[model samples]
Target: TQSHYGQCGGIGYSGPTVCASGTTCQVLNPYYSQCL
Candidate 1:
C-alpha cells in the first residue's frame, strides 16, 4: 500500500516512521553528510 504524508524510513531497519503533525524525521550521517 502507498503511504500518506509525514512518513519516513528508519536506519538499519524497515519500518514505518510516522512523525507527529507539524514535525518530521530525518537521517543523521555526520561523517558522510554535512552540517547545515
Candidate 2:
C-alpha cells in the first residue's frame, strides 16, 4: 500500500494500487497519481 504523500498509481506505474487509511489515490495527471 501507499503511504500518505506517496505515489499510488497512474500511467506507466507498476506500483501499489492501494493508499493508506483515510487517504485517497488522487490523479494529478495521466502520468501520475498521489496518495492524499
Candidate 3:
C-alpha cells in the first residue's frame, strides 16, 4: 500500500493502487495519482 503523499497509481505504474488507511488516492490527471 502507498502512504499519504505518496504515489498510488498512474500511467506506466501497474501495481496496487491502494492508499494507506485514512487516505485516498487522488487522480491529478492521466499521468499522475497520489494518496491524499
Candidate 4:
C-alpha cells in the first residue's frame, strides 16, 4: 500500500480510510490522519 502522511480520515473525513504497509492509521485530529 501507499503512505498517506497527511491525508483525510478520522472523525471528519467522509472517505475511505487508507494507510501504508507496515503502518497503521493514526488519528491526528478530527479532520486528518497519518500512518504510524
Off by over 4 Å in 4: 4-16
- Comparing 1 and 2 by TM-score, which wins? 2
List the global CA lDDT of all models. Answer: 0.40, 0.90, 0.87, 0.64
Model 2 scores a C-alpha lDDT of 0.90
Model 1 alpha-carbon drift over 4 Å, by segment: 1-9, 12-16, 30-36
lDDT string, candidate 1, 1-36, tens digits:
113343254345455565554555554442221111
Task: Return the candidate ranking by lDDT, descending.
Answer: 2, 3, 4, 1
Clashes of 2: 0
Q: Number of clashing residue pairs in every model? A: 0, 0, 0, 0
Candidate with top TM-score is 2
Please state the error at residue 35 of candidate 2 in Å. 0.6
Q: For residues 1-36, what per-residue lDDT tens digits would candidate 3 score against the true structure?
A: 888988898898887888989999999878889899
lDDT of 2 by residue, 2-35 (tens): 8998889879999877999999999999999999
The most accurate candidate by lDDT is 2
Model 4 lDDT, full chain set = 0.64
Pull out the clashing pairs in model 4.
none
Candidate 3: how large is its RMSD? 1.0
RMSD of each: 8.2, 0.7, 1.0, 2.6
Model 3: CA > 4 A from native:
none
